[PDB]
Amino acid sequence: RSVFSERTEESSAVQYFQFYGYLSQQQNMMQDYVRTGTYQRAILQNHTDFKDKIVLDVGCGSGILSFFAAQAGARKIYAVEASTMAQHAEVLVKSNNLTDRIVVIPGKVEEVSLPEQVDIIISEPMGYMLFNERMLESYLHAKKYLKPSGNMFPTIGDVHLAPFTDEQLYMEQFTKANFWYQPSFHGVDLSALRGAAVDEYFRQPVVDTFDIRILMAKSVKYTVNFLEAKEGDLHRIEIPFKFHMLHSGLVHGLAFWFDVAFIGSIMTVWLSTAPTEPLTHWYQVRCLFQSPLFAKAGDTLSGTCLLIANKRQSYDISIVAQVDQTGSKSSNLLDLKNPFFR
Amino acid sequence: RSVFSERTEESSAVQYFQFYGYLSQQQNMMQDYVRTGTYQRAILQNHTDFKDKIVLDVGCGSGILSFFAAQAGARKIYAVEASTMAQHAEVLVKSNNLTDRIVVIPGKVEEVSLPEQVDIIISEPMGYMLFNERMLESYLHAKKYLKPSGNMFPTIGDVHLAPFTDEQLYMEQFTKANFWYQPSFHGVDLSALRGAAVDEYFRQPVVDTFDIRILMAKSVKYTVNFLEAKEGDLHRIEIPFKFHMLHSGLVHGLAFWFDVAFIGSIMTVWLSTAPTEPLTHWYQVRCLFQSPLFAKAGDTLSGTCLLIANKRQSYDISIVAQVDQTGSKSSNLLDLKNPFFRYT
Amino acid sequence: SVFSERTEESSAVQYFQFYGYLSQQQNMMQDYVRTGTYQRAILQNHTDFKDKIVLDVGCGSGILSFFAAQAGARKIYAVEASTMAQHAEVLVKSNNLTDRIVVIPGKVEEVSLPEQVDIIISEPMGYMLFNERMLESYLHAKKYLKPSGNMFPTIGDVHLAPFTDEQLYMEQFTKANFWYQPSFHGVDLSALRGAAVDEYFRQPVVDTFDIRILMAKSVKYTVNFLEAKEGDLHRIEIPFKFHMLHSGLVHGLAFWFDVAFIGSIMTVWLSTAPTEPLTHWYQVRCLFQSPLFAKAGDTLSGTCLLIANKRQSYDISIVAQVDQTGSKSSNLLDLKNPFFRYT
Amino acid sequence: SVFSERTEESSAVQYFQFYGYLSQQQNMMQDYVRTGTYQRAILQNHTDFKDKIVLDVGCGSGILSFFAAQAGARKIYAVEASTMAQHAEVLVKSNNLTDRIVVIPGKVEEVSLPEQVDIIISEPMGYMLFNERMLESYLHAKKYLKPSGNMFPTIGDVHLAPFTDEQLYMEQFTKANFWYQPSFHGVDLSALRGAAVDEYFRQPVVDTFDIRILMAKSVKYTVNFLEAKEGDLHRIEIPFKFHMLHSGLVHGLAFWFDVAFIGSIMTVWLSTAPTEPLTHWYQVRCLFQSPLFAKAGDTLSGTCLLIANKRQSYDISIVAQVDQTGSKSSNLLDLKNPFFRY
Numbered sequence A: 001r002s003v004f005s006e007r008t009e010e011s012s013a014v015q016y017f018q019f020y021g022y023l024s025q026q027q028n029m030m031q032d033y034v035r036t037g038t039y040q041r042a043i044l045q046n047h048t049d050f051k052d053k054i055v056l057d058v059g060c061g062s063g064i065l066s067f068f069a070a071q072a073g074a075r076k077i078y079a080v081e082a083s084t085m086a087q088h089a090e091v092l093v094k095s096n097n098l099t100d101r102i103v104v105i106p107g108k109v110e111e112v113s114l115p116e117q118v119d120i121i122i123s124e125p126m127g128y129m130l131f132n133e134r135m136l137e138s139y140l141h142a143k144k145y146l147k148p149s150g151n152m153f154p155t156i157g158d159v160h161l162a163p164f165t166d167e168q169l170y171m172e173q174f175t176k177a178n179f180w181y182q183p184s185f186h187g188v189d190l191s192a193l194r195g196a197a198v199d200e201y202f203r204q205p206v207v208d209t210f211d212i213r214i215l216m217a218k219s220v221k222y223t224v225n226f227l228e229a230k231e232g233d234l235h236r237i238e239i240p241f242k243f244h245m246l247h248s249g250l251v252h253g254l255a256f257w258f259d260v261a262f263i264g265s266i267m268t269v270w271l272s273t274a275p276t277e278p279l280t281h282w283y284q285v286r287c288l289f290q291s292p293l294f295a296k297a298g299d300t301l302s303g304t305c306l307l308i309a310n311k312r313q314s315y316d317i318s319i320v321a322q323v324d325q326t327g328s329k330s331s332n333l334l335d336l337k338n339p340f341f342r
Numbered sequence B: 001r002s003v004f005s006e007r008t009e010e011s012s013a014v015q016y017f018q019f020y021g022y023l024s025q026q027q028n029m030m031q032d033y034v035r036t037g038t039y040q041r042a043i044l045q046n047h048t049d050f051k052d053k054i055v056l057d058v059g060c061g062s063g064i065l066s067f068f069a070a071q072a073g074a075r076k077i078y079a080v081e082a083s084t085m086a087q088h089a090e091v092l093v094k095s096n097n098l099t100d101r102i103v104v105i106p107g108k109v110e111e112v113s114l115p116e117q118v119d120i121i122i123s124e125p126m127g128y129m130l131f132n133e134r135m136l137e138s139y140l141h142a143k144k145y146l147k148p149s150g151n152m153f154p155t156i157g158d159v160h161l162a163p164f165t166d167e168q169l170y171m172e173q174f175t176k177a178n179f180w181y182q183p184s185f186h187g188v189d190l191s192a193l194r195g196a197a198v199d200e201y202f203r204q205p206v207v208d209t210f211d212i213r214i215l216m217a218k219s220v221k222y223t224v225n226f227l228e229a230k231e232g233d234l235h236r237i238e239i240p241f242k243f244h245m246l247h248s249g250l251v252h253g254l255a256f257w258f259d260v261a262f263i264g265s266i267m268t269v270w271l272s273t274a275p276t277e278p279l280t281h282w283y284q285v286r287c288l289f290q291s292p293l294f295a296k297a298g299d300t301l302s303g304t305c306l307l308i309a310n311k312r313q314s315y316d317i318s319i320v321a322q323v324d325q326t327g328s329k330s331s332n333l334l335d336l337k338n339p340f341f342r343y344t
Numbered sequence C: 001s002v003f004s005e006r007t008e009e010s011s012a013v014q015y016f017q018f019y020g021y022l023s024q025q026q027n028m029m030q031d032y033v034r035t036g037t038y039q040r041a042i043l044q045n046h047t048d049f050k051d052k053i054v055l056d057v058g059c060g061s062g063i064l065s066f067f068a069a070q071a072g073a074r075k076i077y078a079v080e081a082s083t084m085a086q087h088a089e090v091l092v093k094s095n096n097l098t099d100r101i102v103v104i105p106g107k108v109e110e111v112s113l114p115e116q117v118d119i120i121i122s123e124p125m126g127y128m129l130f131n132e133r134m135l136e137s138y139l140h141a142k143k144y145l146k147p148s149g150n151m152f153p154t155i156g157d158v159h160l161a162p163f164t165d166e167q168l169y170m171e172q173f174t175k176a177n178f179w180y181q182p183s184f185h186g187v188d189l190s191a192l193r194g195a196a197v198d199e200y201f202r203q204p205v206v207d208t209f210d211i212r213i214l215m216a217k218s219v220k221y222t223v224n225f226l227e228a229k230e231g232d233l234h235r236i237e238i239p240f241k242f243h244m245l246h247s248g249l250v251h252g253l254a255f256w257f258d259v260a261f262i263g264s265i266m267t268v269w270l271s272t273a274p275t276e277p278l279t280h281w282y283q284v285r286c287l288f289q290s291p292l293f294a295k296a297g298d299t300l301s302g303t304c305l306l307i308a309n310k311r312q313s314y315d316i317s318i319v320a321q322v323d324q325t326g327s328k329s330s331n332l333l334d335l336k337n338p339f340f341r342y343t
Numbered sequence D: 001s002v003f004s005e006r007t008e009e010s011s012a013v014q015y016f017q018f019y020g021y022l023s024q025q026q027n028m029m030q031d032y033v034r035t036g037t038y039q040r041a042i043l044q045n046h047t048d049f050k051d052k053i054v055l056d057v058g059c060g061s062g063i064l065s066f067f068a069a070q071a072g073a074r075k076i077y078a079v080e081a082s083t084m085a086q087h088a089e090v091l092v093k094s095n096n097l098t099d100r101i102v103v104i105p106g107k108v109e110e111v112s113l114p115e116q117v118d119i120i121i122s123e124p125m126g127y128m129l130f131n132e133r134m135l136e137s138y139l140h141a142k143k144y145l146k147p148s149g150n151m152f153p154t155i156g157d158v159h160l161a162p163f164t165d166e167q168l169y170m171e172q173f174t175k176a177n178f179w180y181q182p183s184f185h186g187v188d189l190s191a192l193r194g195a196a197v198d199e200y201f202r203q204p205v206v207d208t209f210d211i212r213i214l215m216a217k218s219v220k221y222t223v224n225f226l227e228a229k230e231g232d233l234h235r236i237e238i239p240f241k242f243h244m245l246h247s248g249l250v251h252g253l254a255f256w257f258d259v260a261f262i263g264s265i266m267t268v269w270l271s272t273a274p275t276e277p278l279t280h281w282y283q284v285r286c287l288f289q290s291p292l293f294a295k296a297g298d299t300l301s302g303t304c305l306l307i308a309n310k311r312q313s314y315d316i317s318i319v320a321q322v323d324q325t326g327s328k329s330s331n332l333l334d335l336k337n338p339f340f341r342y
């Protein structure tokens, strides 16, 4: 038993690595030009952190990030990949004549053996809302192979949270749920299930983008330092928040995005998924409240976002928010493994 | 003892006649040019039905319809009005030098004593959805003064009903009710009242106009013949319907309007409140279903609109509708006395 | 009862039907200035509530009674005469407070309370403060108040100030002149033009306005709810002497009101003034039948006399004169039938 | 059980998780053609239900069991393996039918039912009829059917027809040619282009289309559910000979299906054909690896072999040739992972 298998239901792992075994899914991430181009900039503009160094690429996929490390002058790159994509990465290593520098290691990073410790770990392990897929834990786990004072690319990750107003989205999800309000669907009363239906639909995080003008307060930031954090730190993530409301109106939920920073010796390069920045394949994520909170400009909205990691490689989300001046309170539970792609 | 007081709570009647004692409210009706101009045309173009005749104006308000009867040549017009507007009507009769022909009689038509029987009764007793205010009963009651082979202006009334689709209206009402879904309004859980709030909001008929393209089937018509009907016929009004759906989609409720016809010796003149005709102060009325029914073009939507008169001079409405092909059924209760005036 | 003797049954039925609608309770509840200020007044004076006996006069949905419970009250008697009392009881149960809030259906003049109370809370303010005559019910309830008990709100201030608004004044004749025509469909309506003008002028105008139409500092009339008796509100005489800050034509008097919650920790104010965010009370304007010319530094003196009537409202008599010229005007208004002008 | 023996556990977990969502039951329920036709078939054949004993295989929300009750059934056994069984029980209670409908949680291959039934009702159809392998559960349930009993639906017809769709065929290469570039951010991707092509071609395409792309009358393969054994569905060999009505390049085979409810009063058909209003099944297209030129009046013959697999789906082996020219093509597709193109 490995740390991976201990925290992961077999059914989930099967589907997860089957997904990433598709060339079309690797293509989809590769063609996110913001993502791939920002990773290339981070590695090449910090070429001194790679020159003549030993590298680990956690979850290499096609090999693309290991190719960037080779371009930057790395002496040896261990490219670990658990899906059958590892075989395709090896094909590209050979066809690009980089067999002397990139070594594909098929398997899970929690289970493979490497010949030596490495100077720097590179990975793209970010999911929706940063934490979906639980691959940041594999990235942190890989630090067992990192030399003392080695680096991590990316180095830190910032989760941003902000309240938003969007009656249209709210009513769109409520409308779907109201199917189960019908007292005579082909003669059948469904209404005893209305409550269960509302719960189910509002447990789905909404993945899409939006106009920044729907944000009702400056975002609160929660930072994970990948040089310092341990695997276990991500099992239960408690994010307290206190928003100073800039606009009056209905708060329909919290919007989430994330940034990661590559803190290299030459420069710090940021990859942002904020709604003020060009769109990525992560979009942004919104967690709806089952009923909006009313707030005036100048009020404070206080609470906690609690993320509990689950064995399906995702998170159970609890959001409790309160308008401090009135005691108006909202408690909501979301399943990050059942998003609504809007 | 009066049939009016036997069917009306005092609280309702006081407020009702106070409302019509305002000159601003008489002006609102008078300034509906479709209404007032059509009444004048019906009376003047049928002048031989008035010439040298005896007329009763039921609920004369300012007197305006009695002035039209006098223009058509009536010999004597008894203008009955229960609100304090009766005294203003008297002022206009004197100022228009018609004291020899228009006789204002203050009081309820169920309670006054008229000096003689009349050849023709004129009135504007139509409310929202035709039947609101229960003034049609006063109009019919007044036939105790009508000679045999007398006439009624208007002579018949047609109520039209048709299914409509309007998700925006439906969502607007549901959103108001959603206030009572909040589990923490200033820290208070209101949600145990959510069902009561939805019922209250959806009990309100919606008075406004709309585009005829929201209608999903040809209207069904229910006709009241004022010459033949008895007062008691309006205590319970049962309107069955079967619509042949012309479009697929969500049926959010039934829309209602009405036409009246003045069936004179010279011509029949129609006053219509249909959404294809110029707007009147009656607009149109829509009764929402709490949950819409899905139907496809060619299906049939059948059921009953039942109006039960109440002591607040209005009706309790039950609408039951079923898509025959699927058995999807909607049952709704509306309080016609207290509509939502949505027009702006 | 005291209520039935002062109220025509017809008015009472319509009044309590109105408040029996969830939508009308919602309208008050969603007035954030009103509801939020009540909550703040009660919670920030928690020592006036903690372990105390409370009476809520006209509890509606129960909302003020829940605030008293949030502040720690031992027992709250929530009295409500409309059918809203049944909905309030449903909320007390669903909020798990049956041990602390007792809903009593009926008029506060007619129910029996089982014990005396430390504090009365109520929202009984109408347009111009006094419309609805519910302040009398609030005062009546002091038969249940212990000596040295408190009232929330504690005092009410009605403010009056002269205003200029040429367009509002002229608007009355624009409307009334519908009747000044000699052949409306053949009918000479003109004999009713005076009656129509009169009717329009008898309506107090409910809406808001720009504070720059005000021509003098307001005069204030205060009701101290701890000291006042019911009968004090049957005839309310408000003398005034305005010192005109601007020259112009005075078209009437503008009215608004404030209430203060004078607690042991602090005083909290709820204001409906035109300098403050809008409430569902707006402000109220009573026109003079004829405007009065005043110049800056003149004085405008007179009386606003409010006479309670059995329709749960007031007949308003205003008479005013410009002291330096003798120019005089008056008006009689019916507060029960205001003109809602706000758009 | 029979179900366990033929089904990979990881597949079954995902499968019954899917149907445990009210949103996925709603998706089927809101397919008006599907749900309305089942209701019509049952109510219009009311003498097949009145005072009868019924089995509903995979009752989901219970909707088909309520129709059987509307038709007058005496007792309805409603079997459901997902957690939707708990929601069906709620609806049975709230519709005052606990005396007539009994919800039996579990797989129909594993539960104990006490008595033989007069008629079995079910909606077990997947993409191109057979996907999900639930027709085998439906046929397995005949162990509970009286010798004189009936099956609703009674027969299922799968239809195949050749199509021309130049743009669909070329699209595979447009997507795969992402890999045919020598310097994607400095990397020669070209060695993976063939593997990317192969991957795309192995996915049946789920979407609808204009009937004018069809080049011949369909060939139909009928399963008589009253006669068939579940073993008949493990290997389904569909020979075809198409009489070409149009000359052109045949890019593949299009699939749809009908089912018939053959009752005592009337036969009611439910069709997913492209000439009929769209259902949630759309239609399915399988490309040949190379197009075949066929003239009007030519015959296009071959076989479509559907081989069941333990992922609750089929591998689809298609071979076709133009008899008059000898030109031949083929493909091998994985029905479990279709491309949703609509």
Ligand SMILES: Nc1ncnc2c1ncn2[C@@H]1O[C@H](C[C@@H](N)CC[C@H](N)C(=O)O)[C@@H](O)[C@H]1O
Pocket: A004, A016, A017, A020, A021, A029, A030, A058, A059, A060, A061, A062, A063, A064, A065, A080, A081, A082, A083, A085, A107, A108, A109, A110, A123, A124, A125, A126, A135, A138
């Ligand atoms: N524990 C693990 N061990 C090894 N590979 C993993 C593990 N978890 C996820 N992966 C792989 O990590 C990859 C994550 C991708 N987001 C990144 C692919 C590639 N590095 C790129 O940036 O394009 C997938 O190809 C997964 O199959």
Ligand SMILES: Nc1ncnc2c1ncn2[C@@H]1O[C@H](C[C@@H](N)CC[C@H](N)C(=O)O)[C@@H](O)[C@H]1O
Pocket: B004, B016, B017, B020, B021, B029, B030, B058, B059, B060, B061, B062, B063, B064, B065, B080, B081, B082, B083, B085, B107, B108, B109, B110, B123, B124, B125, B126, B135, B138
């Ligand atoms: N039972 C009644 N007896 C006498 N007047 C009544 C009665 N019911 C209603 N009214 C009056 O009937 C009038 C109805 C108005 N719709 C019409 C006013 C006027 N005839 C016009 O056409 O402009 C109002 O003035 C009511 O006060």
Ligand SMILES: Nc1ncnc2c1ncn2[C@@H]1O[C@H](C[C@@H](N)CC[C@H](N)C(=O)O)[C@@H](O)[C@H]1O
Pocket: C003, C015, C016, C019, C020, C028, C029, C057, C058, C059, C060, C061, C062, C063, C064, C079, C080, C081, C082, C084, C106, C107, C108, C109, C122, C123, C124, C125, C134, C137
């Ligand atoms: N004499 C009375 N006795 C009991 N309730 C009354 C009386 N007069 C008015 N009410 C009620 O008092 C309430 C007054 C409302 N302004 C306040 C409702 C509620 N307390 C709130 O603050 O939202 C209405 O619900 C009236 O029905």
Ligand SMILES: Nc1ncnc2c1ncn2[C@@H]1O[C@H](C[C@@H](N)CC[C@H](N)C(=O)O)[C@@H](O)[C@H]1O
Pocket: D003, D016, D019, D020, D028, D029, D057, D058, D059, D060, D061, D062, D063, D064, D079, D080, D081, D082, D084, D106, D107, D108, D109, D122, D123, D124, D125, D134, D137
């Ligand atoms: N072997 C099985 N035993 C029991 N239920 C099953 C089995 N296989 C599939 N199901 C259920 O069968 C259902 C199939 C649905 N197509 C139909 C749902 C419902 N009968 C309706 O017609 O709307 C899903 O709810 C599955 O979870």
